[model samples]
Target: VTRNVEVTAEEEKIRDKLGYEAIRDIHRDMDDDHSGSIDRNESTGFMKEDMQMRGSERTRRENKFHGDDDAITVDDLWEAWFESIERTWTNERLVEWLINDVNLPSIVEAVKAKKIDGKILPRFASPNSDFLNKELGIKSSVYRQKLRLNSLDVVLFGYKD
Candidate 1:
């Protein structure tokens, strides 16, 4: 059987909100047992952390992000402070970005050299973060051009082609 599904903009927003794992992204699975993105154990572990952090009085571990779907962006303890600790993170696209997105990219040798839990690995970017943003600061090209990087900040911050 074959069928087509169309997603509306709002639905796209909702889908994006679900993050890479909760949607069970084929890419996220990438030859792994658990996608390790939002496994139940991790969810509740972080949910409990967020709950107690939020002063939630011990109810359900799964309820809040279940409402949010696979991901949770807790109201800041404050900006920058919590995005590092709180956001869901993954390397599922690390290989893709290293291959395609970054110019003067880290060598593919990093993949062969690094192994974590038997996944060919490199460092992961934290989501909803200024981690990338700082390096992506104010202007796009000059610094990257100096470094000879084809930075995505042009596309990211609406720098037109």
Candidate 2:
């Protein structure tokens, strides 16, 4: 049941600039059921791969998406992405990424280091542990918080102009 999202202005910025296909791409990224919603399993699968809820999603990660039990929709993820872009001043980062993909991994690596050892980048901080958990490997659900971290990375990569 793909519901018609009342595309918000923030949503337009992503669809218009990244291209219409970007919208669908986001939905496809996490809307596992094609229900136009990101259930916990989908969201958790993307993150807790070695981080986030780490598979205990049946209890919480999936629980948060719903009200009594809900799933985060593409619209929900988009709003977070847009706000992230603005806060991170990622328009500049995006241009640099386009210029040289080689620099991206290192750049993200820096963000990871900061978020882990020292502290998160101020002002342009990431969504949350839920949105962007830095885990190269190792499964440790530890009953953690999980959000739409993948959406931010995807938006960053796809932002066309």
Candidate 3:
């Protein structure tokens, strides 16, 4: 048997306003017992359960890009932020989402060119790049191009492809 799922209009509106931050914040608040990402077993308490359920739904939509692994990585965080920015569908809304929702001060500073010296490359690169590549088993060639591109756009431009 199949079960029907219904989202009330009010619920939909709340989701529309909150975006991925709501899920990330809740997962963080819960200490993410099932992992950094929300799941059925980790869900408890009133607010946490609601966020967990919502996180599950959002995960279903976003997982096509990654997988079922519940742990949140820097890549996963980037992808989620990117998805939120793209969904806004306007430069203003996109900027607003990045500023109010993602709140990566480095990204904001870098984009505006506010403080050039303060900008830093991703942690996965630079002096520690080789070490991280060895640890993660990421090849240098692919890492230099593809991974760099993915990280820059999400961290700086606030979207992924």
Candidate 4:
């Protein structure tokens, strides 16, 4: 089940010192491929050049941390980088998050035009939501369900689905 526990521990130490936001920011910087995840070669190059870690050390670190897969996803970062604390999301913040991260652009505009906020946000996720039909004016069942699932993820997981 475990591949390189020690390597993970060391990486966790680095993440702890840097903070989760720092780790996320650093990943973006190192993600030249724009794949949204760091592959083995990218990780090695970044560690070697930016972190001054030797090739051998980087190799060993990744051998365990990456296992068979070469890329480190956002999911991995969420699981290992830091303590993910759910915080209060304002109405504007929720709209912006859905628009950008969930790709619900029209929903953002609709919610902005309507009176939707954090308190009423969870209600929109329900199958029988008023906003889904009459209020927000979202008519397509396909789009409605998509928004429902994405909204559920926001309410339950505080992140994109």
Candidate 5:
């Protein structure tokens, strides 16, 4: 029997934009436990920390993807993330989020040097040490790792730290 997939209209749009394979890969990366579904525990990392989502809001959002089950599958998160408003943040606004909110002040200069905007910010979701240092001039390895971690939250879910 084939699995019946249910998703939001926003998710259907994302699948069209990002292609099915890419969305699947994105879900795979964030799945954490490789369980084929993201439960409350797993979603805590994505929904709470930087997103600041809590209480009823979190439950309501999760319910959108949960179907009759208590967890969401890959298709659920893809749509939610693609609809995030942060995807429209300008370069200056992105800098503000990193410097003021996310607190990776070390990258402030590097990001400014590159004039990094929302479009380019998603690339850092899977950060590279050499690229951080050589291209963006972020020399600190520690900061680069922090950027990688924080960027994923911002790029994938438009969360604030």
Candidate 6:
């Protein structure tokens, strides 16, 4: 079920650079929206409602990945690790949560080393093999491959140079 979309090497490089640009743009947009303590809703037309929606959606996605449906607080990330340790679990679950949820690879590694404490962690687990397969009920191996292929869109195209 995996469908490959071939892009020229030149296109690939451009896409990566664009991804970095997008990140910078987002940061700039956020800065523009900042208005001291009252400027909480200052990013990309985000209102309070939008913020709540975004947070809720993020919580839902995190739940989908971690198999927990409660609101994703500032503690769930570390709590997950602690719970996993209590359960004698090890692997990429913690790393995966950090990456996908918090978008920080370095912080994810730090958490893995017990060097930091934070709610958002890096996600290092392969979504195709781990969350999508084991948690998301993706039974078909072909479908898993397809998911991975589709995710490269974000991986390659959604960052900056």
Clashing pairs in model 2, backbone N/Cα/C closer than 3 A: 48-51, 65-70, 65-71, 66-69, 66-70, 130-146, 130-147, 131-149
The stretch of ten residues in a row with the least summed lDDT in candidate 5 is: 14-23
Top TM-score hit: 5
| Candidate 2 runs further than 4 Å off | 1-20, 48-69, 85-91, 94-161
Candidate 4 has a TM-score of 0.41
lDDT (10s digit) by residue, model 4, range 91-125: 78778767776677776777777745654434455
In model 5, the runs with Cα more than 4 Å from the true position are: 1-26, 45-70, 127-135
**For candidate 1, lDDT tens digit of each residue in 28-77?**
32213353444445544433442222425222434433434553222111
Better of 5 and 6 by TM-score: 5
Candidate 2, residues 71-153, lDDT tens digits: the string is 66666655544444433434445335423542334344544444432111111123333223344221233212211233333
TM-scores for all predictions: 0.23, 0.39, 0.25, 0.41, 0.55, 0.22
Please list all clashing residue pairs in model 1, or write none if there are none. Answer: none
Candidate 6 versus truth, CA RMSD in Å, comes to 16.9
Q: What is the C-alpha RMSD of each candidate to the true structure, in Å?
A: 16.2, 13.2, 16.3, 16.0, 8.9, 16.9
**Model 5 per-residue lDDT tens digits across residues 20-130:** 344455566557889998776666665665345566556654554454666667666555545667655778888888787667877777677777676554455542345
lDDT agreement with native, every candidate: 0.30, 0.42, 0.38, 0.58, 0.61, 0.35
> Alpha carbon lDDT of residue 19, candidate 1?
33
- Best-to-worst TM-score order: 5, 4, 2, 3, 1, 6
Candidate 6 has what TM-score? 0.22
Model 4: residues with Cα > 4 Å off, grouped in runs: 1-87
lDDT of 6: 0.35
Minimal lDDT window, size 10, model 2: 116-125
